[PDB]
Ligand binder design. Structure first.
Ligand SMILES: *[C@@H]1O[C@H](CO)[C@@H](O[C@@H]2O[C@H](CO)[C@@H](O)[C@H](O)[C@H]2NC(C)=O)[C@H](O)[C@H]1NC(C)=O
Lengths: 120, 58, 107, 220, 55
């Protein structure tokens, strides 16, 4: 199936930026979705995840509420709003389809191609 | 009166008619008890409320 | 949190050679382990899930095993198309985490 | 809405548009509801399943046996029927896969799932009962098959009953639906030489006691 | 055999299955040594198989 990311680009320190992922080929509303970040230094880490119904979220403690994850099921679109950007937030961000509506029993997932966010 | 959280309806299939009828028996029995007691309780209390007031006037 | 340790950080072998890498959990994670293949310029592809269950479309030369804290990944006899960074990821509980990855070069 | 519980749980093609809530206080079906068991057959202990699902504190659907990677020796794409159409196409239940012989054989099937995460898992499957011996040859090849399913609590061998039955939704055969619950720490296994419809999706849950099902056109 | 109930009332249909004491009775009565019985409707579907035993 297909996941297409957009947004990203250059943001100054502080500020904010909205990232998004458009989904097709599957019922968006049937699966949990998540964001993963790939830094040039730290290979891979999770940023956030949201349940299929939008009822439950989890964030990395490297974020602690600095970023917000949300969904629009009608438009099959996943969003990540990042605020107060720092140097450590420079990374390629990726969206993924989670194999479960509830996080806990998902086993495998996959990513679309990501977008680069540079903080400078 | 203190009702517990409940669920009254029950579903039975094609070959469970005796149970469905048992469930009906239970609902009907409870209905007759509550209806009868509720009617008498109200009538009895009303008789006394009115006499109570008459007593106070005297 | 359960942080995975992956080793070696880099491996190099000639085509036809047998290649394996290892990964450890800090805690017993039963078999809740995914292996990914990241080719340069691409999002990582899942190759193996539940420690040893090969994913659809993945060549039969790829395999794996392990449980608890000690896991392994193999690509059997190495083909030139297999240059990638391979990653160890677990989903035992939250947060999900990744190891550092093993870069596999071919020559 | 228009679906009944069997439709929603099995994945009737017309129940796909329904949203999924992580918890339910009660279940509402309209009196006009008539979508489920689109391939004619019995749903075993249907009333008991309906009662168990009336109130759930936590619910999630996950793919238990992935469609594209779990059955390399079986055909997972030809499993469609005119009895469960989707936008005019032959189709099938979204949560089930009707496996058929690959090429000219149906190698013995063997699968398991270990429920080590802590919630109970509802697993559904079904059994195909072809109208005739020609269908058994068309779909499975093995002429005399069996299906075996079990857990630490559930154990049952099934055997297909081939017969010409009255035609319902254009089918002369039947497909029965069965289900069990896998308690945490246990595993469920499936074994078959044919006629098994396997789950691809399963539901993890934590149940509440004391609710029920309302049949009504009253709006939510 | 079949019967179509197109008249409007429900019809109660009864039948039964013979379970012979021995294989000699199966030969005396039916000849076919390994038999089955199948009955069904849009709602009912059941295959039966005789259980021969000395009771
Ligand atoms: C979903 O339910 C509808 C009924 O609400 C089914 O449509 C009926 O199908 C029969 C058999 O072809 C027709 O005789 C009726 O006239 C149809 N009713 C309506 C209102 O169109 C539909 O087939 C069901 N779909 C699935 C996949 O189960």
């Amino acid at each position: 199936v297909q996941l297409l990311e957009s947004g990203g680009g250059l943001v100054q320190p502080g500020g904010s930026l909205s990232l998004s992922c458009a989904a097709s080929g599957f019922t968006f509303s049937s699966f949990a979705m998540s964001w993963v970040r790939q830094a040039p230094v730290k290979g891979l880490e999770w940023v956030s995840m949201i349940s299929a119904g939008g009822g439950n979220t989890y964030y990395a403690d490297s974020v602690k509420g600095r970023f917000t994850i949300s969904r629009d099921n009608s438009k099959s679109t996943l969003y990540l709003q990042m605020s107060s950007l720092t140097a450590e937030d420079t990374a390629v961000y990726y969206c993924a389809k989670s194999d479960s509506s509830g996080f806990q029993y998902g086993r495998r997932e996959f990513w679309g191609q990501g977008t680069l966010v540079t903080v400078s | 009166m203190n009702t517990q959280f409940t669920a009254v309806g029950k579903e039975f299939n094609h070959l469970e008619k005796r149970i469905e009828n048992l469930n009906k028996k239970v609902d009907d029995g409870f209905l007759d008890i509550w209806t009868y007691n509720a009617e008498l309780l109200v009538l009895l209390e009303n008789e006394r409320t009115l006499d109570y007031h008459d007593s106070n006037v005297k | 949190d359960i942080q995975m340790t992956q080793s070696p950080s880099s491996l190099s072998a000639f085509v036809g050679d047998r290649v394996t890498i290892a990964c450890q959990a800090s805690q017993d994670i039963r078999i809740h382990l995914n292996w990914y293949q990241q080719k340069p310029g691409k999002a990582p592809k899942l190759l193996i899930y539940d420690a040893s269950n090969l994913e659809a479309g993945v060549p039969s030369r790829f395999s794996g095993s392990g449980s608890g804290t000690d896991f392994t990944f193999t690509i059997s006899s190495l083909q030139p198309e297999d240059i990638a960074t391979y990653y160890c990821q677990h989903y035992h509980n939250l947060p999900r985490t990744f190891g550092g990855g093993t870069k596999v070069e071919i020559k | 809405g228009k679906c009944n519980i069997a439709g929603w749980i099995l994945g009737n093609p017309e129940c796909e548009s329904l949203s999924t809530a992580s918890s339910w206080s009660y279940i509402v079906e309209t009196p006009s509801s008539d979508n489920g068991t689109c391939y004619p057959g019995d749903f075993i202990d249907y009333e008991e399943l309906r009662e168990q699902l009336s109130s759930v504190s936590s619910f999630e659907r996950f793919e238990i046996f992935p469609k594209t990677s779990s059955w390399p020796n079986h055909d997972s794409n030809k499993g469609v029927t005119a009895a469960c159409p989707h936008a005019g196409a032959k189709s099938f239940y979204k949560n089930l896969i009707w496996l058929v012989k690959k090429g000219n054989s149906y190698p013995k099937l063997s699968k398991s799932y270990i429920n080590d995460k802590g919630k109970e898992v509802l697993v559904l499957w079904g059994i195909h009962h072809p109208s005739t011996s020609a269908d058994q040859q068309s779909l499975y090849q093995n002429a005399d098959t069996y299906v075996f399913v079990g857990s630490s609590r559930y154990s049952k061998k099934f055997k297909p009953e081939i017969a010409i039955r009255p035609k319902v939704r254009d089918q002369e055969g039947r497909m029965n639906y069965y289900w069990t619950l896998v308690e945490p720490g246990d595993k469920i296994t499936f074994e078959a030489t044919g006629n098994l419809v396997v789950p691809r999706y399963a539901f993890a849950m934590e149940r509440n006691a004391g609710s029920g099902i309302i049949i009504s056109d009253t709006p939510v």
